[PDB]
């Protein structure tokens, strides 16, 4: 769902 999210990057980094």
């Amino acid at each position, epitope marked *: *769902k999210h*990057t980094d």
Partner: antibody
Amino acid sequence: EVQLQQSGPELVKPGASVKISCKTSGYTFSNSWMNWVKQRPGQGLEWIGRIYPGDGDTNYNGKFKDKATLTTDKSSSTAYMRLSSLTSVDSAVYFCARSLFDYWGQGTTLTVSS
Amino acid sequence: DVVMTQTPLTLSVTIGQPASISCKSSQSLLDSDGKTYLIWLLQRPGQSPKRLIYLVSKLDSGVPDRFTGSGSGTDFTLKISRVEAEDLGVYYCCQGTHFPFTFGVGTKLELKR
């Protein structure tokens, strides 16, 4: 270090459009989501939406789906937000913010006025 | 949309003393991958926001150890063990589990006198 550098302040008339930029450095631009956030004068933060630059995938807040258009230019590591058919209520500071809001731009002030 | 309710709206703090602020979600923020996408941001006056805490309790790089984040179900807390002047500003909680992502209204930390 990651840095998000936004374009400068804008003053436009109602009905106009504007395109604000967010130039990134210090990481692989294509591989992180870019969010945009609105802050009306004296008010709180509002999420507009996000774009994944590698493939153009987007998620919008429905409140803004007819107002904001997110794009990117991977070759210059720059994210863009276009705001259309502007009215007074679109006057705000707009921020770009990466991924899980982990790095933020310095903000762009938009003033819409006749 | 998920509603994030922050209280108090203003907290009058004292340099050297603890502070605690609360953020409650209208929905569970636990995602199917096990992560809880709850973050805390500080917006100092005249500045852009900065992230301090993410995934409920993890401190961002460079954030002082005086900050702690916790959560139980939909009830989240940010604590400062001893307030310092650089901590003053508006604290926002934000959730990134459910679309659209949403922010609380902000809690302002100001100085008591």
